[PDB]
Design a protein around this nucleic acid. Structure first.
Length: 270
RNA sequence: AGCUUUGCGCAGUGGCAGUAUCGUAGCCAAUGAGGUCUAUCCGAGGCGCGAUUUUGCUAAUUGAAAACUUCCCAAUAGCCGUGACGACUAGUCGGCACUGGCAAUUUUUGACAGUCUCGAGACUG
């Protein structure tokens, strides 16, 4: 009913946002940049949700030809690519070179074995074309997501040294600029970008965002991740302040703080 | 001029508990310790290691001994008789000595004890 409607609405929204992003990328060589950065950050979530609904649609449609494939390929993009590559003919697991670019040899064996005894029936040509167009829409949305992520990475030497460049951009955009970030307590920076995550509480990680879900924090055992978050946030705050005055542009402070964080992690894990 | 607030030091008088007190040329910590109700909120120490039932005094116990310049033998330390010595006329007296005795009316082995009356008497056994 609203499948193509949502597809077109997201196409228009992504067209506007990607025009803005490509204009910024071209211009790389009162309407601040962090505004478009946060816009892209939320558009990423929108794209993820749209990809999820598209994946659900594809699963429901393809569950009559190869009902068992969903179990073997839990990942969304991999499942979409596999259904695109197999189509109505399940005899494409034999001597296939594209399938080896999506899955591992073990799961290729498993899917080939399962396809031989599946009890599924053929799809009509109309259903096949609907599935193909859905897959193409998913792939183009994924390409748009990749472009957004490239721009988001391209977009504060010390704060970036401590935590990447993507997370720094996310936290500064949600804060509303580097100056606004510099004048917040660390306990508030720790909570920038935290959802509510309705229960269906310990299993939800109630108070975590943009620092808990970071490369350097997720790089620890779960039981140490909250403490680490705190620590990182603390040091991040310091770096932010040093950045708000344009001092230590070489990143010396960031390197020192990262070394201290690494020493604390090592001591925790000894 | 008194009254009064906070912190510290020094003493006196009370209460409570010994599963806790102390140390930290070890590490981390307001540039944030620690957050299991409880979080755009709270806000100080934590971790590891180490010591463990002071001293004087007093009391009790163990044992032969519990920690600081006695036992034993010999002898010395009232009268009636008797033996001598002596004195005075068979008798008497004085002192000395020790070889039997000293609860049956005049003495030293208990007519005493209780009671009552106003220094004095009575009653009972």
């Amino acid at each position: 009913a609203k499948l193509w409607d949502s597809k077109m609405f997201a196409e228009i929204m992504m067209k506007i946002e990607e025009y803005i992003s490509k204009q910024a990328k071209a211009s790389e060589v009162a309407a601040p940049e962090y505004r478009v950065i946060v816009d892209a950050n939320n558009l990423t979530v929108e794209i993820e949700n749209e990809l999820n609904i598209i994946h659900k649609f594809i699963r429901d449609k393809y569950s009559k030809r190869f009902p068992e494939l969903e179990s073997l390929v839990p990942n969304a993009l991999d499942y979409i690519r596999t259904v695109k590559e197999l189509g109505n003919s399940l005899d494409k697991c034999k001597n296939n070179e594209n399938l080896q670019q999506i899955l591992t040899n073990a799961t290729i064996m498993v899917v080939s074995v399962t396809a031989s005894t599946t009890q599924g029936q053929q799809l009509s040509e109309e259903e096949l074309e609907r599935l193909e167009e859905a897959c193409d829409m998913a792939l183009e949305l994924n390409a748009s997501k990749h472009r957004i992520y490239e721009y988001v990475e391209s977009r504060a030497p010390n704060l970036s040294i401590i935590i990447g460049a993507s997370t720094a951009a996310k936290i500064m955009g949600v804060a509303g600029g580097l100056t606004n970030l510099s004048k917040m307590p660390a306990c508030n920076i720790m909570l920038l970008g935290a959802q509510r995550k309705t229960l269906s509480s310990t299993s939800v990680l109630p108070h975590t965002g943009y620092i808990y879900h970071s490369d350097i924090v997720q790089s620890l055992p779960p039981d140490l991740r909250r403490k680490a978050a705190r620590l990182v946030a603390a040091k991040c705050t310091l770096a932010a302040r040093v950045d708000s005055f344009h001092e230590s542009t070489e990143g010396k402070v960031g390197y020192e703080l990262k070394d201290e964080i690494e020493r604390k992690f090592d001591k925790w894990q000894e």
